[PDB]
Amino acid sequence: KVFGRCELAAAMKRHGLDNYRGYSLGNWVCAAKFESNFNTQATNRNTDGSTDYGILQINSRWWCNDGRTPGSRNLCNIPCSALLSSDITASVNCAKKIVSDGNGMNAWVAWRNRCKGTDVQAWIRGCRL
Ligand code: NA
């Protein structure tokens, strides 16, 4: 599924991401835009042979099982394919564990490089939330 900007902002808000670990909703929408262009089916291979899955490009190195990332963990206890669903529940629940891990949203290099410090409120501008 390719979410609309406000559609994804509403779904993240309903799933309790708004101000989760102190990150305002625009931070999450901005991260999703640059990680996946709001496409749940986005996948990208990392240099290390891990893969990133879904709207928030969650990595098989630590967070999900894809059966092809040697010596990896599955800390969200899900198959990585669950992260490609039209229903963002699994992505959001796993994102909450990642952002609680100690480095906040710096875990998402595209958030650090492209969202951090920017006017992230612009990402929820005009949305009926
Ligand atoms: Na894994």
UniProtKB/Swiss-Prot annotation:
EC class (word): hydrolase
Entry comment describing in which tissues the protein is expressed: In the egg white and polymorphonuclear leukocytes.
Chief localisation class: secreted
Cystines in this chain: 6-127, 30-115, 64-80, 76-94
Domain C-type lysozyme residues, every copy: 1-129
Reactions performed catalytically: Hydrolysis of (1->4)-beta-linkages between N-acetylmuramic acid and N-acetyl-D-glucosamine residues in a peptidoglycan and between N-acetyl-D-glucosamine residues in chitodextrins
Molecular functions (GO terms): beta-N-acetylglucosaminidase activity; identical protein binding; lysozyme activity
Keywords: Allergen, Antimicrobial, Bacteriolytic enzyme, Disulfide bond, Glycosidase, Hydrolase, Secreted, Signal
PROSITE patterns named in the record: GLYCOSYL_HYDROL_F22_1, GLYCOSYL_HYDROL_F22_2
Top-level taxon of origin: Eukaryota
Gene Ontology CC terms: cytoplasm; endoplasmic reticulum; extracellular space
Oligomeric form and interacting partners: Monomer.
Function summary: Lysozymes have primarily a bacteriolytic function; those in tissues and body fluids are associated with the monocyte-macrophage system and enhance the activity of immunoagents. Has bacteriolytic activity against M.luteus.
Additional detail: Lysozyme C is capable of both hydrolysis and transglycosylation; it also shows a slight esterase activity. It acts rapidly on both peptide-substituted and unsubstituted peptidoglycan, and slowly on chitin oligosaccharides.
Name of the protein described by the UniProt record: Lysozyme C
Lineage of producing organism: Eukaryota, Metazoa, Chordata, Craniata, Vertebrata
Gene: LYZ
